[PDB]
Design a protein around this ligand. Structure first.
Ligand code: NAP
Ligand code: 4G7
Length: 318
């Protein structure tokens, strides 16, 4: 369908363009979700410590390696450093906890989950008595140097960023003494948040973009009935019908044809399989431009408790 399965990163490794998301996947369902995903062809799993389910994801990965369904070199496992671990002295241990939970001896890609650092401690969103999230004084550049050390210690094959705006990406690219460029910027992207400006910037610098919440995250905890719904949008349903595909399949193919990686989440076996069957059809340029036209700058993930943080990413236009 004029679509290779992997994209070349600026560390020389290849990354599968379709992966399985795991945010909100219940711990009692995610082991089977990941097992099914690997069985039906997925080779990329998107994880994070803050999702609280890496142990269970790891059970699935380990079982499929033990069964010899896949080899480790064929898998591309991604995780993310949470905001309460941006300190120099905490990054390695945070990575190692993720490795130990996923039962891996390296990650293919490790991302700074958000540009905002928070006060270390047990709470993922540490609060002051008035409800503000308590920042860390550690900046993007020192956290990046700590990520570079993980490459040099063999814990991770690639490092990258997530939810960084273009000026924050530029700050790393301009970092004095930069050793490794970010390989990936993982950002929200779908027809209601099309991200043309940030995508063009990242791609022009050789940074691969991964699109998260490609279906509009209908299970996001803060969903409201009046919010727009990609899966129910009749205009998108019409494009899907024309191609004899589901709306979800169109929503997954869309970023693929923009040279993006995409990570739809499901714990439903039939949908996991459905969502992978997107290498057998092509959207026209006209379809692509039509889908782009639906942009309304609508965000699933606004990190709304952190809008005063000095490194909050979404005040900038892009
Ligand atoms: N870097 C970040 O800050 C960040 C932020 C958000 C997301 N992410 C990553 O991106 C992943 C994907 O985003 P997301 O979880 O927000 O949402 P999403 O992938 O846009 O949507 C997931 C929802 O769609 C449903 N669904 C999946 N396939 C479907 C299909 N074929 N037909 C109908 N409904 C379908 C799922 O239901 P069932 O599971 O019940 O089948 C679930 O409710 C996350 O899981 C996470 O890995 C990263
Ligand atoms: O990072 C992602 O994939 C998606 O964002 C999350 C994921 C988590 F597992 C845990 C928190 C988040 C997140 O950013 N919540 C925002 C939020 C809203 C209201 C009150 C507390 C936290």
């Amino acid at each position: 369908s004029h679509m290779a399965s992997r994209i070349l990163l600026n560390n020389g490794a290849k990354m599968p363009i379709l992966g399985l998301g795991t945010w909100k996947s219940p711990p009692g369902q995610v082991t089977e979700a990941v097992k099914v995903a690997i069985d039906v062809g997925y080779r990329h799993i998107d994880c994070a410590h803050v999702y609280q389910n890496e142990n269970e994801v790891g059970v699935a990965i380990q079982e499929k390696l033990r069964e010899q369904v896949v080899k480790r070199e064929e898998l591309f496992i991604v995780s993310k450093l949470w905001c309460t671990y941006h300190e120099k002295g905490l990054v390695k241990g945070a990575c190692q906890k993720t490795l130990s939970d996923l039962k891996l001896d390296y990650l293919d890609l490790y991302l700074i989950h958000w540009p905002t650092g928070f006060k270390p401690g047990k709470e993922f969103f540490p609060l002051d008595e008035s409800g503000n999230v308590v920042p860390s004084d550690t900046n993007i550049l020192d956290t990046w140097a700590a990520m570079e050390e993980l490459v040099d210690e063999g814990l991770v094959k690639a490092i990258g960023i997530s939810n960084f705006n273009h000026l924050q990406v530029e700050m790393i690219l301009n970092k004095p003494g930069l050793k490794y460029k970010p390989a990936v910027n993982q950002i929200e992207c779908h027809p209601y948040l099309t991200q043309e400006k940030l995508i063009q910037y990242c791609q022009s610098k050789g940074i691969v973009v991964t699109a998260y919440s490609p279906l509009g995250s209908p299970d996001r905890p803060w969903a409201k009935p009046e919010d727009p719904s990609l899966l129910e949008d009749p205009r998108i349903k019409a494009i899907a019908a024309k191609h004899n595909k589901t709306t979800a399949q169109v929503l997954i193919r869309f970023p693929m044809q923009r040279n993006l990686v995409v990570i739809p989440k499901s714990v439903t076996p039939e949908r996991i399989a459905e969502n992978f069957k997107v290498f057998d059809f092509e959207l026209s340029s006209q379809d692509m431009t039509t889908l782009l036209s639906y942009n309304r700058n609508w965000r699933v993930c606004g990190l709304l408790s952190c809008t005063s943080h000095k490194d909050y990413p979404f005040h900038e236009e892009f």
